[PDB]
């Protein structure tokens, strides 16, 4: 529009509404999902919560016995008959005692992605160096994005690991679809 224009007879009130994501911690509904998915080399899109540890592996006795100890490290304990409790109900039991932040397995398995199929030139320290300004993510939300990064595990999606920092821009949205937040 031209300078010193009349701006028409139109008018409006000052300012407008705004919103931001809550600082709510991670839920066991995501941590349980990734710890089983990564053990079965499956994605969260192929792990139905409506099933059990014994039904997910097809009744295999070994993996069923390994997963029985994998949640005990990440939740400090496990409920009764967990190998007969589906993940859609087990997660509802795990959040009753979860610390709201990653366990020792779901924080150490994150660096294995960087050596499983990822290229070279990038690190896990520079992957968590910033998120509260790259996407505005609050401190309680950043702990769930790395869980979804471990379940994505691309076999080939980057020609250089210097571009893997731009790959974290996707993961922020992958997690938002799970909790229903906006970006």
UniProtKB/Swiss-Prot annotation:
Could you describe the post-translational modifications of this protein? 4'-phosphopantetheine is transferred from CoA to a specific serine of the Acyl carrier domain by the C-terminal PPT domain. This modification is essential for activity because fatty acids are bound in thioester linkage to the sulfhydryl of the prosthetic group.
Which residues are in the Carrier domain? Answer: 26-101
Instruction: List the taxonomic lineage.
Output: Eukaryota, Fungi, Dikarya, Ascomycota, Saccharomycotina
List the protein's name: Fatty acid synthase subunit alpha
Q: Which residues of the full protein are shown?
A: 138 to 302 of 1887
Annotated positions of the O-(pantetheine 4'-phosphoryl)serine modification: 61
Query: Which species expresses this protein natively?
Result: Saccharomyces cerevisiae (strain ATCC 204508 / S288c)
Assigned protein family: Belongs to the thiolase-like superfamily. Fungal fatty acid synthetase subunit alpha family.
Give the record's subunit note: [Alpha(6)beta(6)] hexamers of two multifunctional subunits (alpha and beta).
Q: Which domain of life is it from?
A: Eukaryota
Function text: Fatty acid synthetase catalyzes the formation of long-chain fatty acids from acetyl-CoA, malonyl-CoA and NADPH. The alpha subunit contains domains for: acyl carrier protein, 3-oxoacyl-[acyl-carrier-protein] reductase, and 3-oxoacyl-[acyl-carrier-protein] synthase. This subunit coordinates the binding of the six beta subunits to the enzyme complex.
């Amino acid at each position: 529009m031209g300078s010193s224009h009349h701006h028409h007879h139109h008018e409006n009130l000052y300012f407008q509404s705004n919103a931001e994501i809550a600082d709510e911690p991670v839920k066991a509904s995501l941590l349980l999902h990734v710890l089983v998915a990564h053990k079965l080399k499956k994605s969260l899109d192929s792990i139905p919560m409506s099933k059990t540890i014994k039904d997910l592996v097809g009744g295999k006795s070994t993996v069923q016995n390994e997963i029985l100890g994998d949640l005990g490290k990440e939740f400090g304990t496990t409920p009764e008959k967990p190998e007969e409790t589906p993940l859609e109900e087990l997660a509802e039991t795990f959040q009753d005692t979860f610390s709201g932040a990653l366990g020792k397995q779901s924080s150490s398995l994150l660096s294995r992605l960087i050596s499983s199929k990822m290229p070279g030139g990038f690190t896990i320290t520079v992957a968590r160096k910033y998120l509260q300004t790259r996407w505005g993510l609050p401190s309680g939300r950043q702990d769930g994005v790395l869980l979804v990064a471990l379940s994505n595990e691309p076999a080939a999606r980057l020609g250089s690991e210097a571009d893997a920092k731009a790959f974290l821009d996707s993961m922020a949205q992958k997690y938002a679809s799970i909790v229903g937040v906006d970006l």
